[PDB]
Amino acid sequence: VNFPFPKKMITESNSKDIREYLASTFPFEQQSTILDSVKSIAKVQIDDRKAFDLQLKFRQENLAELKDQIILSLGANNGNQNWQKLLDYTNKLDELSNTKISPEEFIEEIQKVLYKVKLSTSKLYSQFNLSIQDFALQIIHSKYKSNQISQNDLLKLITEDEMLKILAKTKVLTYKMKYFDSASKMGINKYISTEMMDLDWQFSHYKTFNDALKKNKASDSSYLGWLTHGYSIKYGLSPNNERSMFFQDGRKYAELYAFSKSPHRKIIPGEHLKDLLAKINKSKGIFLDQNALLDKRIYAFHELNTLETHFPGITSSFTDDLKSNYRKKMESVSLTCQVLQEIGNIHRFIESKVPYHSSTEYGLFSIPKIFSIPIDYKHGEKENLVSYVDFLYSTAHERILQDNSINQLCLDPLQESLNRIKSNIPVFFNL
Amino acid sequence: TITLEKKVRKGIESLITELKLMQAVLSKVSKVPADQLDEGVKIWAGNVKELSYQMEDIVDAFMVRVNGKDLHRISAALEEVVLQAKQLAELRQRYEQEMQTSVDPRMMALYTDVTELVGIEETRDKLINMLTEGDDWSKHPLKTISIVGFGGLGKTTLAKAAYDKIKVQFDCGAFVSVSRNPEMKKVLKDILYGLDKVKYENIHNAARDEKYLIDDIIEFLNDKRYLIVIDDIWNEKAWELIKCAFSKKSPGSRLITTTRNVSVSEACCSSEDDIYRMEPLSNDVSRTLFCKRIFSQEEGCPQELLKVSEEILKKCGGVPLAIITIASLLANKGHIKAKDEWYALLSSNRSLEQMKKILLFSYYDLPSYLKPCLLYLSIFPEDREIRRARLVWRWISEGFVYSEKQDISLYELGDSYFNELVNRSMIQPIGIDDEGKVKACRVHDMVLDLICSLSSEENFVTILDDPRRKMPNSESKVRRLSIQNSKIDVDTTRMEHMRSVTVFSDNVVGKVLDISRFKVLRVLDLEGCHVSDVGYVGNLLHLRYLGLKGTHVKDLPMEVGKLQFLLTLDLRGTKIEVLPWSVVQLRRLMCLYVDYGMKLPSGIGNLTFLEVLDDLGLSDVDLDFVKELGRLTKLRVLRLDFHGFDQSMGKALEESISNMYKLDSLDVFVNRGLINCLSEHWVPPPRLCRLAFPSKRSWFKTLPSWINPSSLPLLSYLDITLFEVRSEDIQLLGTLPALVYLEIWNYSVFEEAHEVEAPVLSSGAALFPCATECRFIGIGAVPSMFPQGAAPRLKRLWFTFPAKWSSIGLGMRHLPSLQRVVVDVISEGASREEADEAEAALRAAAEDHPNRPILDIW
Amino acid sequence: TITLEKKVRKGIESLITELKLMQAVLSKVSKVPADQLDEGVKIWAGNVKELSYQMEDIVDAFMVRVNGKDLHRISAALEEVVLQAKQLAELRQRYEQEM
Amino acid sequence: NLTFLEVLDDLGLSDVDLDFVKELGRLTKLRVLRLDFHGFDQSMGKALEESISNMYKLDSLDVFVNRGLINCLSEHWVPPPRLCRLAFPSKRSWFKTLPSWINPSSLPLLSYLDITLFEVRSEDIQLL
Ligand SMILES: Nc1ncnc2c1ncn2[C@@H]1O[C@H](COP(=O)(O)OP(=O)(O)OP(=O)(O)O)[C@@H](O)[C@H]1O
């Protein structure tokens, strides 16, 4: 049996309740929602100063907790991995985090720590290393938001090559390490786009940097996107099993940039532009045939989406686009990935409602137990959650186009998710 | 065991001499057309060919493997092959007994009715205008036109049409045809008899030498206007001699020549504007000719035949000869054939014999050392295109390329062979390589069928398709194999003497066949297949070409060091990361393709003879490596990456580069920043001809000082991105002699916030001799750039124009040869009312030009 | 017995080539009208025809029957027919005069 | 097992089981065929017509039937493409109206025909 889709048109009345509910409960504060796209759900009234000092406390607690674990991990280790070195790293971490200093000193020490963590025995050892890096750049983001650092120096810090080659690595690896098992058990991992990574409260800071580059140098923003997608393919979020045509190679970004500055190159292409466009048309064709396998179509969609979002107009060929009408299809799949990510967020949040779930369900050091959002069912929650999921599915059901050639990638994931969610909502609602 | 060695040496020398003699005989035989050989000589020649193969194999085995067992096997094989040679000689001597001429098949075409030609009017009138061209054409000096193309294209038909049309406006004329092996007396007598049938009526019986005939022709043409057509010229000496009769000056006279060879046409005409290149018919014209030829009166094709008709017309290619012959084949004047019979013909008589005999003239005319190089093209599939570098390296590996001079490189010999094949109009070139040469080539389909039949009749190549071209019925000795349909299964237990294997299948069954049993291989080509790992590549000991491109190979066996003969090693698109160390010990190696993500071992200096090196890593490398780089002295192509390479040691690198005397192309790729190598006072190599920095985000500072036209006398390509361009920088580029292509970027305009500045050129004329393209991306000015008329060869211009400068003139009459202009406008400073103003203004400025180039504002 | 098999194969291949050559010669001869041939060529051609018949029979016997006795008979016949061919060749060479 | 059979004349086709009529479908390069239908039981004609449709190269075909209505070569048969001669010399065993597969698309080649129908229509000569 398939549960039928909810059919509601969005009302400002329940909009008020759902809005203050999202603005009040902790995890939904720092995240934004797709529903902001709706006509009339306005009246947010949010201030970020409180959320900011909350993030300060969260970072302090998490660094303290991992340090607590580091001492005892040094106590009884299976092959000494120089854990006191990572301890010194978290020492200078807390040092830089607590005091106010001159901007130059912060630059020097941040660069030093980051460049020396750059250079395999244990796995949670590497996890601790990755968390060190993530906390360091989170400190960077907070410090910038704390108005203690200008814009000029922040750019001079971030735009240099090594920092660009690190942002993407961390942004992909931490997300994988934190959400891959959840995505696998939920069965949506096949729909994970690097484009929508910075929509979780766990990766809001990245987003900041992103618009910062959209502030000043779009070239570096597009370069960062083309870098992070390649790094995602490398570490096995999307296996193609043979090779990528245009993502791991340095001489491809040069051609893309050259086209981006003078577009007429597309009309009179060189050889490298020629085989680029040939591969693009081939991947397009693969994406637009319904009885090819699902994984190939998903991979092709991801590649084409990254190319179109970062280098606009390169994938466009006027005539055949109308006969195929794949543009709206792309938009539909993107909408599907966004809504699926949010549904996974809600499913993870449900675990906070379990009477016995002191253990965090988001990842290592996602939440310090000093806050440890409780089991206390509130007045609104039991209604607001079901209302929010119904509104999500209703808002989604409209913009999606319906055709069995495209139905395979957007309709059935939503249908299966609605089924799983409608099945597991009650059993958790009892106990 | 000493006498064993000496006896074997003597036997080998004898074999070498015998091989020379056999090749002489075979080359002599292979010139006669098949209609004049008798069966005895043909059979004997086939057997001689087989013996030649065996003796070559024995000689090669001795050269490679040189112990007791080897010498014993070699002595046994030597004795056996000598015995077989004697036996065949006696056999031929046993049954030897000593015991008219046809006409050229192209002669009948001159008597074809005129109402059966489809699309001549346009080309006929274009040629006529190319002849007269004006009102006072009867007062200009003598002019010569030439027509080139492949056979069966319709050259003599067009010449005949124009001649019959305009012969009235002259005094005397003639229409002569020269064959392949001409007699000059006959040609001169033909001209004389054509000029006046009454006076020189018996001229064909006179017996004088050429000087007196030429004098007669000169005396008769005094004070006359003449129009003369000379047809089917096949080489240069003929024209060099016939040109003497038209030595005097005669205002208003015209000559036309038709030929298949391009150099001959360049030698006939003076300017390259007096060359007409025949091109095939369009699709509609071809279809009407087809219909008219067969459905003659109805001209209505039934529907079931439409798609087979379209595929057949695509296979013909717009060549009238093929269209006519296939239409006569399908007509079957009694009855149109059935649809399934059309399909059978598509998948697979007098007219057909005539067409084959006509097309084979270009094959029987090649020099003897070019015939194998052509047949080798029958290995590749039908409609795809072939990389030329692949061809050249495989020709060198097979042994078709050799010379005795001491100072010659085989790579440029092979390139010359390829260019000669293109010159005779037997190959269509396509694209431009990344080293300034042709990229790929295509072959017509009927030519491909002819080549396949020719090469099959001699066991040159065996193709494996399942529907057609199955295994030969009775053949135990196959030398070259080509797998195209993986459906078939292969025996490969009788194919002891293989030489070359090639797989064209994406299929898994393609990797099924066993290879380690071909103990004598020279060419292994698995490009594109999905093989995963090859540990058996060692133990082959004979390879010359190892092509593994686009395969799923992760790592190489550390035994490749045994392949002491290995010319080419191609690793691109594979999954390898670190090359095995023993690679250093491949002393004979001439070409190394590799990705920049692969680690090379240390002692790379030992690989002398390297002529091509592609995509050096240059990252995480010490100094002795960059110093070793200076030992590869005969190296003609280089590509670098500068990825992790530390820019503190660039001086050693530039010295090592300056050490290479012979060198043509060079790349430097840099991610970002300022390039910290190739400093001034560098003394680049003299023969450099192509230079490129495709980075586009790593700038130079002002300009390298070594760009003066004295240090780089030869240069036909350049691609640079400067930080800030001056006005007297384009001047230095004007100083360069050749500089065919040019492309400059201004880094400050895009990445920084600087504004477009108008450059001004001054103090000179003829600034850009031989500049056919120029792309000043980031800096633009039409008039002030080119004063007095300079660069009278430009054809494509790229420049930028701010809308601010709406109020400099866009006059395009400085430059005659303009054909295309691409512009981009900056509109933020000026309002839209100035924007569309400037748009319409430059549009009109383009419209006034007589050539009327095309615009793009973007 | 391995050696015998190898030898018989070689002999048979040689016979096949020789048969091709003989048929070429005979076809070339049989075009001339009888008034332009001379007697020497005519007689030699008759004898060549007979030898061709014998060699065809030997090849066919090998193809059908292929053991010891058979291979022995085939080797004997092979040697004899080769000898006869050589003898006829010498005979023709002995009395050839161009005039 | 007798592949390479190019000509087969006057098959018995009487007192025969099905595997025989199925084997008949293996002779692929067979250009002439003649049948007798004497004691052959007309319940298995479908297997026979499939086996016949399996022979791609084929020129001539006969079917001889003593009496009655011919219960083989039913419609939707897809005759071989190259057929050029067809004959039923019975003269006392009729077809019904007409085989449907006589359209000029299925038999582009045909230079001979000999049929005895039960009742001829007026728009039967049209198809011819
Ligand atoms: N426009 C046309 N319409 C119909 N038939 C044509 C046309 N052009 C050429 N042909 C036919 O093509 C055949 C061969 O053309 P032609 O011999 O003139 O080519 P060519 O260039 O002289 O060939 P080659 O180089 O071998 O001399 C002629 O029989 C002619 O009838």
Numbering used by the authors:
A (entry chain B): 128 to 246, 250 to 561
B (entry chain A): 22 to 87, 113 to 145, 151 to 399, 407 to 865, 869 to 919
C (entry chain C): 22 to 87, 113 to 145
D (entry chain C): 664 to 791
Task: Quote the study on this structure.
Plant nucleotide-binding leucine-rich repeat receptors (NLRs) are intracellular receptors that play a key role in the plant innate immune system by sensing the presence of pathogen effectors delivered inside plant cells during pathogenesis through direct or indirect recognition. Sr35 was first identified in a landrace of the Triticum urartu relative Triticum monococcum (einkorn) and confers immunity to Pgt Ug99 in bread wheat when transferred as a transgene. Direct effector binding to the leucine-rich repeats of Sr35 results in the formation of a pentameric Sr35–AvrSr35 complex, which we term the Sr35 resistosome. Electrophysiological measurements show that the Sr35 resistosome exhibits non-selective cation channel activity.
To circumvent cell death activation for protein purification, we introduced substitutions in the N-terminal residues L15E/L19E (Sr35L15E/L19E), which are predicted to be essential for Sr35 membrane association by analogy with the ZAR1 resistosome. The final 3D reconstruction of the Sr35–AvrSr35 complex contains five receptor protomers, each bound to one effector molecule. As in the ZAR1 resistosome, five Sr35 NOD modules define the base of the circular protomer arrangement, and a helical barrel formed by the fivecoiled-coil domains is buried at the centre. Unlike ZAR1, the leucine-rich repeat (LRR) domains at the outer region do not pack against each other in the Sr35 resistosome, which might explain why this region is more flexible. The modelled ATP is nested in a groove formed by HD1 and NBD. Instead, the γ-phosphate group of the ATP forms a bidentate hydrogen bond with Sr35 NBDR157 and NBDR311. Of note, the coiled-coil domain of Sr35 contributes considerably to the interprotomer interactions: the C-terminal half of α4-helix from one protomer packs against the C-terminal sides of α2- and α4-helices of the neighbouring coiled-coil protomer. In the cryo-EM structure of the Sr35 resistosome, the EDIVD motif (Glu-Asp-Ile-Val-Asp) and the adjacent Sr35 Y74 mediate the packing of the LRR domain against the coiled-coil domain. In the cryo-EM structure, AvrSr35 binds to the very C-terminal part of the Sr35 LRR domain, supporting a direct recognition mechanism of AvrSr35 by Sr35. Nearly all residues that contribute to recognizing AvrSr35 are from the ascending lateral side of the last eight LRRs, and many of the residues interact with a single helix (α10) of AvrSr35.
